[PDB]
Amino acid sequence: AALTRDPQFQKLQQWYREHRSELNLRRLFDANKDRFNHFSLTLNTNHGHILVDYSKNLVTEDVMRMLVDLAKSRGVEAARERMFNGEKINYTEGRAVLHVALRNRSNTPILVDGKDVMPEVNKVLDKMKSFCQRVRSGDWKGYTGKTITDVINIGIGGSDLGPLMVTEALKPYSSGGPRVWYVSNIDGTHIAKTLAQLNPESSLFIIASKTFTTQETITNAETAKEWFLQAAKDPSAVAKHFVALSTNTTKVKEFGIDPQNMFEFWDWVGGRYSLWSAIGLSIALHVGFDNFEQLLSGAHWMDQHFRTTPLEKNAPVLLALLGIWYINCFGCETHAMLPYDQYLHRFAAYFQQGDMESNGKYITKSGTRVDHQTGPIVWGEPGTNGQHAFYQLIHQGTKMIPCDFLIPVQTQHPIRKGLHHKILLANFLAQTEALMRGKSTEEARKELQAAGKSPEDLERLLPHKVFEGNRPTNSIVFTKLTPFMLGALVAMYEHKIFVQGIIWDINSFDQWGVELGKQLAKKIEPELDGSAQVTSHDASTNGLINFIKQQREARV
Amino acid sequence: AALTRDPQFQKLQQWYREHRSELNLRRLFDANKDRFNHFSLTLNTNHGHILVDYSKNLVTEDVMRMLVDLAKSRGVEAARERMFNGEKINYTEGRAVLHVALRNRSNTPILVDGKDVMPEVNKVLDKMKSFCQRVRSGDWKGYTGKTITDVINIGIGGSDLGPLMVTEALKPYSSGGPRVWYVSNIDGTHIAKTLAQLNPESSLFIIASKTFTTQETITNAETAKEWFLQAAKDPSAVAKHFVALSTNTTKVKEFGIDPQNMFEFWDWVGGRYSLWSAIGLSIALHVGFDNFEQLLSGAHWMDQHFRTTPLEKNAPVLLALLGIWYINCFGCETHAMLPYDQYLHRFAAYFQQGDMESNGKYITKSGTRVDHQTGPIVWGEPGTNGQHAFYQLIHQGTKMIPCDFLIPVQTQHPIRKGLHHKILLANFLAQTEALMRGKSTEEARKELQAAGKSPEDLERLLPHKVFEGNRPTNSIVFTKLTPFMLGALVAMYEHKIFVQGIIWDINSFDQWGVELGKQLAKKIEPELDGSAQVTSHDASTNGLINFIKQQREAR
């Protein structure tokens, strides 16, 4: 593959093999009291600062130099320009990749097929703004003359995870907005338990799907429309309670949605990069279009940072390169994202798609099979909860796990004169300090003796109380989790993912891996009808189906 | 380490190095149409069936025999009996391990220090039953005479994840129960946004903590109590709105809760094994004590299955051994848990603690450092959602990821004459089939030809459409997700975790790895007050603190 043949990558791998056992964080910090200043970036967005402290990583100045040289050798800057200039860098599908245009507040022209896309981008934004003002003010009325109290987004994957994550993260900014609900699973309990809590007269359904053919979403949509029409009866009332977010006007029309109720986006908006488009309507209804615009503006700021900053001081580039170091030299399978913020509780789940569906790939641009690792498994839970669930393994298991710890300095809820947030910050700081420093046999022994342990209780317990440490982390600290700041943070990780894919020579913007499961499900669906045994598959699929048919009738 | 020296383990590794390439699922199924029968288990619990289909794994009959021989050599059965008989198998803390006693419906004596624990277990269970009856019926009144409409569990980790996951999973059984809320994070957002939706006069707070000293929980509990007393003003009203679930009577009383309002458990109940104890009180309040007893009864059924079934057909043993194979021979770092059930959306998060905190260890019983892998990173999201988020990487990334796919045959919400559940079942089946079979270059070339692609376009796209497959899965199908069935399934995984830990020679039941972070946070807390710069830690900790202090005033 490209990367394995690259001379700067080989230089990196060789340095790693020779100097690996020289990378100990305790000794690195004891030896260089300027390590924080040299291995961190402080960004002023003018709407909050962002400190990206990457100094608790297993790197030296030489390692960072070699990584930046790898980015240059792999052509990261030229690929970036291709994206921003509207070239068809999604080469398997022959499409541009222009989520950056969706938030291009500067309205600099971006040409696709020789045509500036920004007028169309701004036309839809204007339509979203109008619609949100009317719904939130109460001017948009239901079929019995009532204001909308509940907005229900029906969509899955990229049509769900983004808006859900953002409305959870920005819940303090939703005063005066309708309640927002997210229905995504085809599993009928999802729509069933939602609809049981809603009044058809004051519920607005948003049907979100790029192609508008996804079975889960269309089936949920028909179930909601049947439920609505059982109450309203009048088919003309659907135009007051159903809108669609999509690129497929025909399928939206055939589903029965008023064409004036379609909020359009384009084929160069990837689903996992789509919350910035019409797909974000549920965000703008919930927290208002002004806050949605702030969210776009934060992403736009980080877009310009990525575009204008020399690589050695460029935040998404450095984050991407530290990942390459741990993925392709240290061999770490996973990457944990640990926001110390309850409002960010769906942030890790969002970048499970954003990261893993982008870079969970194995074919390069030349059609060649990679001979190296690509994207990691992303996971995580908010702090401090994770400390009492799985940090045991991070501290004392047998896995190397690069971790990003994130926290806002200022809380949305400064209760008890800031006591809760002070403890939260103390734990945020302590855990990365603990992961780095550990605790030696000698230090553990002195503690046990001071505690009063007998020589026999001490010797039995001692080895279990040792922390080997040397476990690397990023600490990402920002002034406050505002709409703007969330936009900048999400964009920062979007460009991290971009840079890694360019280095790996893969396509971060296609997803051919979802097709096989969809084909096979289409063939099994009809076979579940009737009680006849199935013999048309492998023995396991047959046996599972036939067990399902046996127990479908059992009375528990 | 014990495992590395084990002759059966070394035999496993040798076979792996020599016959790895024989393990292709497409060929194995084509060569043995009885593969499903040979590598699956059916369990009749009398309250539903459980099909544990492990045939889509990279195993042969020889591999399973070698794996079962490993469990024999490592003494799994003798360790099991030590657990069930009340011996102090949590050897670093000198404690028994008796979550199986909490659900011992047979009331067979289980002795700790020569004294039966079941009379006390059943005394607490009886107290839980009476309390749930009084709260749920409205006979227990708040300080202004209203019935309780909201129960708020305040706790973290083991005192949070289990009860939350079970009340989410059993929501259909909660008619007639109060709403339940879970406050766990110290982050003031969590308690603040909960309290804003509640009325002190009809809210019952459950302060859940084994030691009753966990800082997040005691801080949250004091904040809730201050909020409550701002409305009630009368300290005597606390006795009507605050109860404690704990082992520490002294600290519960110092917090100001009536001893009569304390539901006790015992030191041999691990936090991540504690939903079966008084810690489960919010479950019983929400779905009723009868449904809580069914939950316990299902775990009890699985306990007996684990105890009496030969290893070669013993569900948790087989799941454990399969994981050993992927962890210690193939080197897989993670284990994905994928319930095709929206009600189970917190199931994977629960076993993040249950698995990772139990087996995320590196010191053996003999005090020696392991020289092999131990517990995996557990993760997952409900299907079908995950298909549209990260399955791309499972199908076409560069990682080998063992997955457990779970689903109930019968849905709690058979809307549209079962259409939604039919589609869900079809995806559940299709995804493991796709993971196993993949799609070859020739198979994908044919699809592209039929799609009308130019020869140039076809050749460009073809390798991107290939699925290498041979990706193993477990499929766990059960009749219906009832309280009983949930208990059986959770107990199954508890015993899987037990077996793996014994094989690794680690202590599944301590958690010394949480102490360091607690110590260092205690040191940092008072340094955060004031605008004075901190320079007493490493340069990063100092720089982070000083940035926090700088940005604390920014507007």
Ligand SMILES: C/C(=C/C(=O)O)C(=O)O
């Ligand atoms: C998951 C999904 C895919 C697509 O339509 O492209 C959707 O938005 O429905």
Ligand SMILES: C/C(=C/C(=O)O)C(=O)O
């Ligand atoms: C996480 C925890 C630990 C303990 O109290 O032992 C708790 O239940 O509060």
